[PDB]
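A common beginner's mistake is to predict each chain separately and then try to dock the pieces by hand. The better habit, illustrated here, is to supply every component at once so that their relative placement is modeled jointly.
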Amino acid sequence: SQQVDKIKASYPLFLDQDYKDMLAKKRDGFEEKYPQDKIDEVFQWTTTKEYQELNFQREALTVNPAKACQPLGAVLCALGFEKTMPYVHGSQGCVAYFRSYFNRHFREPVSCVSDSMTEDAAVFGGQQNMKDGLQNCKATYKPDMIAVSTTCMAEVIGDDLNAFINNSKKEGFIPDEFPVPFAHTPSFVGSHVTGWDNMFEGIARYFTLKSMDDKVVGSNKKINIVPGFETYLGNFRVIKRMLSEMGVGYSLLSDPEEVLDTPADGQFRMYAGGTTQEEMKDAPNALNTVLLQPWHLEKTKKFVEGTWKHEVPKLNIPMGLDWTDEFLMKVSEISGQPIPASLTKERGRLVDMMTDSHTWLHGKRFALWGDPDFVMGLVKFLLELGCEPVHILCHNGNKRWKKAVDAILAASPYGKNATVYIGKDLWHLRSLVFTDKPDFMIGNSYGKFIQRDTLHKGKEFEVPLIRIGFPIFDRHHLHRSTTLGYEGAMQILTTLVNSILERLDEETRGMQATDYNHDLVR
Amino acid sequence: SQQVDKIKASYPLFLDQDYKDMLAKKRDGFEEKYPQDKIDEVFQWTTTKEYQELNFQREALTVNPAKACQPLGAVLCALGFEKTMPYVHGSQGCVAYFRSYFNRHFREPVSCVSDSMTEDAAVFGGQQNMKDGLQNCKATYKPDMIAVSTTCMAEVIGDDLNAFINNSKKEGFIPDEFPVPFAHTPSFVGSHVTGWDNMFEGIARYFTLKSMDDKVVGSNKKINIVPGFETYLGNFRVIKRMLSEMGVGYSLLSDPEEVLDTPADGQFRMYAGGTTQEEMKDAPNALNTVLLQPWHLEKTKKFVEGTWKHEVPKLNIPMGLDWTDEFLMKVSEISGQPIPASLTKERGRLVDMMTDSHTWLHGKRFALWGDPDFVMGLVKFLLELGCEPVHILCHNGNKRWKKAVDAILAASPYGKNATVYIGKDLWHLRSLVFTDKPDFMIGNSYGKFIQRDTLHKGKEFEVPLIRIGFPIFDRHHLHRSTTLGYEGAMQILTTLVNSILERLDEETRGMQATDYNHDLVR
Amino acid sequence: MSREEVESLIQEVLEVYPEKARKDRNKHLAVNDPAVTQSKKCIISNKKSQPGLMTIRGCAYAGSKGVVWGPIKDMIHISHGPVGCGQYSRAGRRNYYIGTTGVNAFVTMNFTSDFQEKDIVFGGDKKLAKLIDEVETLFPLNKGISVQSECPIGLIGDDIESVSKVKGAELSKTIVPVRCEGFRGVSQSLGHHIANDAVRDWVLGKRDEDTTFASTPYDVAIIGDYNIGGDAWSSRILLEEMGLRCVAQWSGDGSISEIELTPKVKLNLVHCYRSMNYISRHMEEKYGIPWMEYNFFGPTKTIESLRAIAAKFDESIQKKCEEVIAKYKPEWEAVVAKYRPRLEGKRVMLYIGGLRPRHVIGAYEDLGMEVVGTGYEFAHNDDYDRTMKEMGDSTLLYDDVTGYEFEEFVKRIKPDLIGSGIKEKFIFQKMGIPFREMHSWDYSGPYHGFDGFAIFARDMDMTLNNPCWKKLQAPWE
Amino acid sequence: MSREEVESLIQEVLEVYPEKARKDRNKHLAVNDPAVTQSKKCIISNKKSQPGLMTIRGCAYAGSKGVVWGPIKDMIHISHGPVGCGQYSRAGRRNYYIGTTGVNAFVTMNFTSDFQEKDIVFGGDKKLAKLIDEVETLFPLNKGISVQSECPIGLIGDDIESVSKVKGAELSKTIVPVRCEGFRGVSQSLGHHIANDAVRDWVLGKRDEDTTFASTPYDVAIIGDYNIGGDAWSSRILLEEMGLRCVAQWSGDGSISEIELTPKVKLNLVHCYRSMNYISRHMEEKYGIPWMEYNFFGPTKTIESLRAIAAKFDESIQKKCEEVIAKYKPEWEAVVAKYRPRLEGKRVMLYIGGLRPRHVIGAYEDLGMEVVGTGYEFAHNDDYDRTMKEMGDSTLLYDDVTGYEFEEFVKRIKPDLIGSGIKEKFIFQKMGIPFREMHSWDYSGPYHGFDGFAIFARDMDMTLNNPCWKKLQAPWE
Ligand code: ICS
Ligand code: ICS
Ligand SMILES: [Fe+3]
Ligand SMILES: [Fe+3]
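With all components supplied together, the output reads:
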């Protein structure tokens, strides 16, 4: 039943007595459910150290991974170029999924097309799909450029993207001068960040490889910035703002911030902003190229150093105090621009915030996961705050990255209880946060189920989730946040300390039991 | 006892069995405590409609007020002027309290001095205190200006600030040219916002009353901005940024944002930033004066219109969508500057966030309190979101303000269940949120005790607190936030929708009980 | 409205396409005439999508793993292949269930083989066998395993059928191989068909020889309700109030024992014909169980459905049906009285998957609303046969609509409300048109049944009449 | 060291003052000599503050309402006057208690008469009477009412004593008038004295004729512990483990019945001499109860204190004392072993109210730390008498230090750590010097007793050795 003045949705509607009785009847009569005592015993067992040993002996089974496939990264990279249509050569279900994933993270329209290869292309290839799809896409959505990636169907059958596109051009399906960069993005290799790297290298090669003769390093007095796979609009914005404050000429290559933040003013803008083709053509003339997320920009680094002849600086991701300092100093050295007083003051304000919340931050134990560069930047900032990373997980990390993170940890006393895991998933992490309980988790929305499980063990065992990373599906507008630079460090510090204080307030709220510590002033 | 490797603070140390037993022994043996059944019965009674009827019959007793005394506002206003020392004529305990209050809100040093009047001044006045204090303050802290307010001791004995300061100047304690504006700030009248108004009017009069002869309205091509009592640094910053984007020349009068946000770089800066004396002297030459918080800037309005001859626009506080629009349009009309495309895009982005979050915001019921302008701006924005303000409380509001808020409420269907209370305190509001339960509270840190009480009734009766306003003592760095303009509206929208979703996640976390609704995607 | 105007609009929209794409897309757009019964003569459906045109369709893996098999709570469903497919589909669909996740229910988890290059080159059958052993060790209370093939499985020479047979015989466990590779078919619909075939071949008949389950003349099964937001529960309560015993519901909040018990029921109640007609027809042939379509969207359809279902049984059930209708009448009448004045006259366009574009029209009409356009991603011609008599004259029909087409149609028709999926939502919100998600119910619901109707009406009012839609134009421009 | 260097620093700091201010402030700054036990010949204290110099001192009302009376949990304390005073002092001091706030405890609430202009002009006695009636109606479980006068009450000639007497007789309730107007005295200290007088006159002797309380030779009262962060509880557990019975606890977590029962104890244990010496001496004269000062800051002081207290009773208590000391020895020994190497050699400056600047020194020395400077807001000359012998030779002493003075002293001395209140914290954090709040324990604690010592050591280490302090200089500056 419903009351017209207070209508109830599924929660709490299904807690009504009639629904509870009906569900109990269903369970008892037809579900053949394991007895509740068995369920409790098995759950308790899944929280144990012996279960963790079994769980970490896994070799073939992956449970709740913390990564996606390459073409998602390729699509995100393609979205950062002006009037560019991401085009995925392969099956259309992949594109439906990529679009919905990005829709739910950004709450914004995401444009992407496929050439809808079917069983027929499994024996004849997808050349006809490519020709007709390029013609249809260009005619219908009027892009200035089509950036081609691949699904695993196309990769397994070995579709030659270069030959297909060249034949499409010769046969008049699309003009010969129409830019169609391409990249092979096999989903059984690496992850979404690798797909971003491959797509970016493809675009850069397409625009610069054959015209290097008239290129002179430093002639345009700019620094190229490659952000990598970035899902916080504030990060693009803060890099632009920081370079503008220094008076440093720059070229952000793959800038999707406008197309992912269009206003709601009565019209649908399929394209907005983005790196122009002229910027990509002129990039080799820059002073140097800075890679913001080097640990998944390796192929791009190889191309930029080998072909553009730029001496790409060895810089970490500009996260936290020290790495932001190092990034700014390297930019100052490259451009000859001094670091202005505004950035010095902003740095001092971040230090001020640190000195204030240090008493609440000190010694807090964290489990965290995400992409390699983001994870290592977060680890470095946590060590700067006097916090203890305990479980550091990166499903798509590698041995070299793990060694670098271990060297970061060894440089600080606060890294003594930390362990870095690569190739492990969120079921592994669930076991870890049961058997070596941290104070909090920092990760994406998939950590909410771990918080649910730890609460099921008991309130004293619950590990609250702090949502930083990608994807974030169960909160609104957090994609507007910043994690890079002093501003990002400030936002992260605020989030962390206020999560700590919110948990403390929750634990001390009980009247006449724990509220002796429910202080007004913290 | 303590374990050296896991040391416990008061919570949870005092939950140990030995401490529990000792406290039970203390209570049983020596406290003569009412039996727990009586305590439960009285609490339950305090949650009732009959108790609320008794509570709202109060005429002489105030419990948990939601306002402070005038000189606190006067000190905040004085802090906004360059190298200015707030000087409170009266008792030193008041200054200790003002400084601590602002320290805890801003987490920054707050400079303020007293002339330490004692019982001797109660008999013979505080003229000598004024002379010696002005001399000592100027000699020691080297201010460019001393802004004098009063505590209630000085007001009750009727100390003539004008005569005292003039006598100090003639007798050589301070130079005759040294600016010493003053204002009577009686704490038994109005509240802290009234003190801000009085101090600002005093400073403006001191700098402009006697030099009006050569003043020509509009000759400096600027608009004066008076922010009033403002405790969000983001608000000053957003007003400055928005006026700079429009290319509008402006003069922010009483700008304390620099002195309340100094960097931690190894030196203590007692003064920083602030409105200059030249700006105050030249203010009458502006095109017009805009008051950001008109409902406590009445005396300032009288002086600005009567003496400067500025036609002060009738504008609401620039909060929400419509009032930000109206503020920008009035500024455009006054300055002849068009509204630029950046502000149009920012407005469209706020509208986009509204459309993205409307399904979760719609129909949510709120109790809120704070200062009049802030409260009415929040009410207007909540009506724009499709939310239902239910209990609107302003302890320092008046009848005319209440009528204006009632007219705002009547203009929207979402205001039909709203009631505006003036002169009521947080004990009244506690009764209201028990007997007509809203979904959330929006207010300052004093609402946490109401959340505690509602939780004590039961989890189903708990009303979570959303901390917006002043003071905020139990979270860190929220004073950096913004509430004005499109940016402030965006921040508030994000806070509200994510508070809603966080509560929903909490209520649906129980495994096999309510987690059927623990959705990944919201 | 104004038929000739609508065909004009169809032609003007079509002009932008190249000739092959234009000729193809012309067959997929028709102006409705309720007199027409054979929809093949007007609109074409269930064809391949045009490359490069931004279709909304999914793949067969979505239709099988995402739709049919995934909701089965007490089984573990393995996404066999590279990491993407299981990750993008993890918990994206709100097929609600009661269980202890990770212990005895597994719906919102993502089990995958996470194919690497070596698994592509040297095959993945041995990895599959080891994975199944790992599943058994780590999730002992699971009641069966399904293997949902992604694209590379079909492309490379993997044979998951023999692995499933061998391992299932070795561990005495039901292991269901599903060849739902995403390149098969043209949409989610062949995914439905493949999944139904897997159910029939590996699960449905396990208890053909077992006769220990006690049956009654009032035994029914709910087929093709996936319990989005609790829809199936909100329908089941009405059915049981009518005096029927719901032995099984497929597949939302479904368990493998319920599937195995289905052949023992007296009547199959089919909600989604598109996805479960295959198994319903099979059950009628092999077990003699009749089936019927029903509709619990809005009070008129719900009342008609309850009366027809009760008519399939004795007089006592019919009396109970009249009692249920009488008991609920004031609730939906109060809903209508409160929300019809706020929605009367408003016009809606829809674009959804295989069933809901026609199934929800009755509820809109119960709120005095008109559906001026509807269409499907992957429906078949029988679905359009039902839709045309459901829809009014001169209304627009679109099959497998492209993003550009739907945008142009909306810009011309200018409906007051659009109901579609997540990939269209923000487009039309930017266009300033209220939008309700009609797949996930915008994380709201349930909408089925009398209790669902109140939520439906509240949601449509709160979105259609929201103040945000009046603020898209800045006062200065 | 270098006594001459410190005296020169005092002179150089003083030069900026005008002549009268400089001459006054010269008497309040001294270089320590432990052999000098007559501090009056060396430093002066408990004098008026110099106007305009930014003192740290509060006022009588803070010393009475904020310090002595406010912690009494089962009474309702009325801030009589305008709104500011009660609001700024509401829950600002962490005097912990067990109770049901708003029902039978009222510590963190703010009851006030909220004086308006008409109350200033026509007086406030009638408003006070009506307020007391309203309190009785709305908080029936309150066990007494105190009236804490703010400045205007003394200025307008209001007679709160007669109102309190009349209403208390009318309602058979204890109503305690306190004339703690903020203009009285020169600091919180006269607030302490006024509050103690109110306790003596209106509460302490209510049970002089009552002989129904059963007493033992081991009855003690804790006087002058306000239970900051639970300090008094962490001390009470040690006392009870020694075999004593703590009848009363003034005033943290205190109740009015405990105050009334205090005259029945055998020994008064005074923690804060400065605030409660008045009532302790009164109790000795009137009831013959001896009193003694103790110190539970750090293992050395607490061991000495436990032994001295046990020496006042028979041999069984002394045996229990040795057992308590033995039981706790490994805990504080482990704390010392862990944290002394991290803090050995570090130098601290302090500035606090009236007791702690000398009481915490032993705790600092137990971690191998030196107090190179200390001072008081409102101490008296007996306090400096006690302070000099505990501070090192040629250390700096400052009474009622101005903000400028303390900043200059810190700039010269450059201690490794400063302990003071909230108004100095961010000043010295911006100067890059670690700072611990020594009033509120930085929202940490307790620090008293063996359990408190571990928290103290962890706090000092976490702040002193925090990495933030090494980052104040930008690498490009
Ligand atoms: S199964 Fe089908 S697309 Fe019948 S694949 Fe799709 S939960 Fe739709 S119109 Mo999402 S044929 Fe169900 C459907 Fe309808 S996922 Fe749901 S809403 S009634
Ligand atoms: S009462 Fe006094 S200022 Fe003795 S007014 Fe003050 S809780 Fe201080 S040095 Mo705050 S004479 Fe207590 C004190 Fe000491 S408030 Fe506390 S820390 S031991
Ligand atoms: Fe959006
Ligand atoms: Fe600060």
